[PDB]
């Protein structure tokens, strides 16, 4: 029952059978978001106007408005090396791979 | 300019209403600068709501 | 127990005591997001790589990975007319006010 | 080019495993074009997971 915060989430590609196409890396830290989004919202959550309004309304009457959710609001990329369709090795920067801040939306 | 997000990190991080009045004072210390920020009016109305919920005289 | 979808959420500024500073409008349709985010994810959800990976991991082992959440992924603005600090009437376009699509994040 | 999001809207919108094999065929009909899309490999591995969950011979 703690605030919306970032937590460890380890991603292992070998566990997902993606060893058949991913070269490197084989695992990375991705994190995940988890926590309560109740009124009021913290500065580091830096949410959307809609998020503010929905939170305030959920605080006023939880029966008529459900609370917002704890989700990633800033992400960073990682670069993966793989073999695509044409049997070509590709170094690609995949976006939105590492959660860097959580917030309420 | 506006600095209600500090009261959003001061009251939110801290049986009687000796603390809710402190939040009301934190918000009223900037009762002019934040005329426009949605979070300011939201916090004022939320303090009003919590004032008539736990019976604060 | 339905998919992550958009639902009606009516915002009435008079109910929030914001009648003391907002001129017009006095109410608008904002919508909200609600629904399950389980594997697989639909095309219209168009989610982030992290969202895909977290959903897949939650599907593999729900004990080690929690599911993603149903949140607004596209929003539209509305224009509000109000009186600010200096007793000046202002027509401002506030952003992220109307949910226009939901997704999993 | 890639079109796994239709199988993500066909199987996901539809006691036996006569339908999970249909999803496997939907994904294998494009077993080359989507070599790179995370959702393609995710759907393949998820079909593999659901294949060994409801006992499909």
Author numbering:
A (entry chain A), C (entry chain A): 397 to 501
B (entry chain B), D (entry chain B): 47 to 60, 74 to 116
Give the article text.
Repulsive guidance molecules (RGMs) are cell surface proteins that control processes ranging from brain development to iron metabolism. RGMs can bind to the cell guidance receptor Neogenin (NEO1) and act as coreceptors for the bone morphogenetic proteins (BMPs). Structural analysis of RGMs and their complexes with NEO1 and BMP2 revealed a common RGM architecture comprising an N-terminal domain (RGMND) essential for BMP binding and a C-terminal domain (RGMCD) sufficient for NEO1 binding.
We also determined the structures of the RGMAND–GDF5 and RGMCND–GDF5 complexes. Superposition of the three RGM–GDF5 complexes reveals common interactions between all three RGMs and GDF5.
